[PDB]
Design an enzyme around this catalytic site. Sequence first.
Site, PDB file in Angstrom:
ATOM      1  N   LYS A  51      59.677 116.800  92.603  1.00 42.28           N
ATOM      2  CA  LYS A  51      60.274 118.128  92.708  1.00 42.28           C
ATOM      3  C   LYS A  51      60.080 118.769  94.080  1.00 42.28           C
ATOM      4  O   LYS A  51      60.719 119.791  94.356  1.00 42.28           O
ATOM      5  CB  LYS A  51      59.718 119.041  91.616  1.00 42.28           C
ATOM      6  CG  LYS A  51      59.834 118.444  90.217  1.00 42.28           C
ATOM      7  CD  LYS A  51      61.279 118.081  89.899  1.00 42.28           C
ATOM      8  CE  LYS A  51      62.056 119.324  89.502  1.00 42.28           C
ATOM      9  NZ  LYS A  51      63.490 119.095  89.176  1.00 42.28           N
TER      10      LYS A  51
HETATM   11  C1  LIG Z   1      60.706 120.924  85.350  1.00 37.27           C
HETATM   12  C2  LIG Z   1      59.773 120.581  86.212  1.00 37.27           C
HETATM   13  N1  LIG Z   1      59.284 119.215  86.239  1.00 37.27           N
HETATM   14  C3  LIG Z   1      60.204 118.088  86.202  1.00 37.27           C
HETATM   15  C4  LIG Z   1      59.391 116.818  85.943  1.00 37.27           C
HETATM   16  C5  LIG Z   1      59.939 115.724  85.345  1.00 37.27           C
HETATM   17  C6  LIG Z   1      61.408 115.663  84.950  1.00 37.27           C
HETATM   18  O1  LIG Z   1      62.153 115.470  86.105  1.00 37.27           O
HETATM   19  P1  LIG Z   1      63.609 116.201  86.239  1.00 37.27           P
HETATM   20  O2  LIG Z   1      64.343 115.421  87.261  1.00 37.27           O
HETATM   21  O3  LIG Z   1      63.476 117.610  86.736  1.00 37.27           O
HETATM   22  O4  LIG Z   1      64.398 116.121  84.963  1.00 37.27           O
HETATM   23  C7  LIG Z   1      59.174 114.595  85.121  1.00 37.27           C
HETATM   24  N2  LIG Z   1      57.872 114.581  85.457  1.00 37.27           N
HETATM   25  C8  LIG Z   1      57.321 115.669  86.029  1.00 37.27           C
HETATM   26  C9  LIG Z   1      55.848 115.643  86.406  1.00 37.27           C
HETATM   27  C10 LIG Z   1      58.078 116.803  86.271  1.00 37.27           C
HETATM   28  O5  LIG Z   1      57.484 117.924  86.865  1.00 37.27           O
HETATM   29  C11 LIG Z   1      59.214 121.628  87.175  1.00 37.27           C
HETATM   30  O6  LIG Z   1      58.383 121.297  88.063  1.00 37.27           O
HETATM   31  O7  LIG Z   1      59.605 122.823  87.080  1.00 37.27           O
END
Ligand SMILES: C=C(NCc1c(COP(=O)(O)O)cnc(C)c1O)C(=O)O
Lengths: 475, 475
Positions: A51
Amino acid sequence: ADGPYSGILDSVLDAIGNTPMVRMKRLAKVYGLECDLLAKCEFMSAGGSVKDRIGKAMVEKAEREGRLKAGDTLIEPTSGNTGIGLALAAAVRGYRMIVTMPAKMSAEKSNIMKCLGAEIVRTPTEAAWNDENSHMGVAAKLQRELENAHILDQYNNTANPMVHYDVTAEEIITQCDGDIDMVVIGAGTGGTITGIGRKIKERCPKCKVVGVDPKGSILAVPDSLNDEKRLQSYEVEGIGYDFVPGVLDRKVVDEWVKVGDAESFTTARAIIRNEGLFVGGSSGANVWGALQAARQLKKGQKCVVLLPDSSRNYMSKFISDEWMAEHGFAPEDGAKVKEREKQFGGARIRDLLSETGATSDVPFVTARLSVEDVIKMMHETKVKEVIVTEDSKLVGVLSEDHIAHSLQSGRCAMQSPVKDIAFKKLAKALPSAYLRDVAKALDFSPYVCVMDEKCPHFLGVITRIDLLHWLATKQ
Amino acid sequence: ADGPYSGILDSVLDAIGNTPMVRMKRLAKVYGLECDLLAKCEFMSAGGSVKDRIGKAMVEKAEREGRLKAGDTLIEPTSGNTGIGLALAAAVRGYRMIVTMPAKMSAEKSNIMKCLGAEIVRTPTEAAWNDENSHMGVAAKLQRELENAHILDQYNNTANPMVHYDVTAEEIITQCDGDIDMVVIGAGTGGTITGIGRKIKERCPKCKVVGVDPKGSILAVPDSLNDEKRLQSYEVEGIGYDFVPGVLDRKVVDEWVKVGDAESFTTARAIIRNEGLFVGGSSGANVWGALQAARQLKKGQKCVVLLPDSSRNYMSKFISDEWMAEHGFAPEDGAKVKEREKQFGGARIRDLLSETGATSDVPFVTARLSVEDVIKMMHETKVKEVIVTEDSKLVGVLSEDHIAHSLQSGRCAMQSPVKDIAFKKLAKALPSAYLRDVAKALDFSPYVCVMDEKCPHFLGVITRIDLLHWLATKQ
Ligand SMILES: C=C(NCc1c(COP(=O)(O)O)cnc(C)c1O)C(=O)O
Ligand SMILES: C=C(NCc1c(COP(=O)(O)O)cnc(C)c1O)C(=O)O
């Protein structure tokens, strides 16, 4: 060679991305998978998460549109990683950060965003997305009540999917040289899966795209897959929500895999143990889903799995076997805990002290004897080690070797009390304790001293070589 | 471009090194330093430390000399990072790991090397190098008592300095384009400073080389610099010893800087806050020494500082402000703790509740009322929030918004008890508590409920927006 880092960087923001792709040959061999299981190690970014890219990118979009001036306040609901990325971007480019995150998320994320000068307001875990006590509603309230505040709203901002469509998917394509057969990727905000899958299916339509959803969320398709634990809170952090985000295009993904907490965590520990990737729990979920999905693939085909988080954010939570035992999760197939439980079983230190042969004649001193008196007693008693204790409750152990070498080193005066040179780090145990527990305690303390605690009559000291000799008597 | 990572990697071992160089413009501006303070971010390696390189390299040397066969046991005394690197190399190439580390070192290193399937034996902190209870003597004993065991002995093996002379120093040269005026680097094993300084002075003799030594060690030259705290245990981990290692060539370094624990830790927090580099304490020591040494430099000149460790290994120790307060270390110039202490001072929640205006009329329920009864009472009393409690000691808070939305979401039955839908994460406080403490507690809990604890007559609930409004009344 050296193309991306061959120069000096203006700030940490330019160190986001450029993450390597590693082949998980050993893990595939462990789980019996024929194809090449590739892992995109996103946790090697500056802030240790994927992120960071979208954080930097949303800041860039807010700056290219002139919607952002120095001194402003940024508000963002997050599970913790986006908060870290935006906190980095703010501490660099001079913005104020205010983060809203549920109480379920780990404490390391909070401590790190506190070190980054970001204000932290937490929300209850059980709150639904419609509640004004949700992180998103509270973020909206703060925007309404604060001046010069902005919400980038990672759930609906197009930068989040557009950047994974722009650079990250292109990175994966360039390193896989176009040959990608399956892509397994967690469904959190859904931006990364949307962007990456869209770019890949554009440049490789034959590639299947599989999404990972924790048991508890309603992001999987169809609803027959969500009924396992409908809207039941889960320990995995980062993935799964009680609503479909604005950026998630559920049509770009072909299959869906539901993953529980136990499988996610045990597979994360398996990744750490077998590949040596200090990775997070959501990555365990993703890799478990990949192992379930790409089973039908054959050799030569490549299944790409995303590793979103580092162990840094879950260092106290699931790396520590104590907390996984507290939540009753299978540690691993091959782990130190299972190894100790196999070798020792319920063998207690009474059994070891009995089979070894001792008479509990460990000398004691009131911890303020002069070293001359204690060495006279040690030479008259012929023992090598001694245990020092106080009257108000133990001080530690003390050996003649340290006595001599500290006297030569100029740290032990002849008239000085023995407390100054004794070993002050100790672990107390009692005869009913198992050998596995003293083995776990030896991981953090050099000696383990026993006591009855009924007179304080200790029977001896235990070190790792003692257990090694005991195991040498066994087989 | 993409030269080093443009392909797929065979294992994590090939992801060691290739760390970027970042310009610490903001930190220099904070401390008032004219020249360019460059930082070699070694913590971005696979295992998050510089010693991964030497771990991999010593394994490579043991394999090119045929001294190493599969299934062997590797023993290594370490402060924790070399243990991690060699554990990675072993888990990849199929070797058994046994690590000896002093009890002073953090617990995260132990947990991580346990996850990597490495046996951990700890040694007392106060033991001198001559003691057989030192990590090195215990390693020798294990080598003598174990079959197929090997010690690579990072303190005397030539791979440790030769590799920093081969690749790392060449990396620094290629990214600084030869223009290096000062190099500040910590003195632990001394291999990195020896190798890097030797290569740089070969390719740039005008470059000064400065070594960093914690107050307590005897590695600085001359002995007038060590008398501050002679052989006094210190909290900084990784640097400083009570003897000169075999690989350390103290002649290659020009100046020496002694650094205490407080300066190291406060500068590490300053690095995290101002640059956004999740870095370790030894790196704080190095950067503080660099700020003291390169003060006389002018613009254009570049002072290169090594950042050996990540925050991951000291996540619980010094990132948490609690432990730094327990050891009485200045948090930072600009930190959240000092900010809260400035805004709140000793203002207690009695003052806030008095100036706001309340009558402690917060409703209570026995936590198993049907939701119909509790909503009837809530509508008859006109209040919005309610506190649920048990008889055997608090359950939490509960709001009508969550009531309605959970009833619509299919998680709240009409006959169900209110305990199922209440917010179960809570923080108990009492009127004598300061506002800074409730602000620290809000970092980890969404609500803060007060109580007298003399009847259990709580006066109200506190959230972050309450403190924000209170501060809006102030200035
Ligand atoms: C939604 C959030 N996290 C996405 C995330 C995800 C999912 O990834 P996405 O591409 O956002 O769907 C998987 N693993 C971790 C540790 C994550 O932090 C955030 O940081 O607000
Ligand atoms: C001696 C060891 N540490 C070296 C080290 C150092 C000193 O680096 P040297 O190049 O080995 O002198 C600085 N910071 C950290 C976190 C370190 O771990 C070890 O891992 O065995």
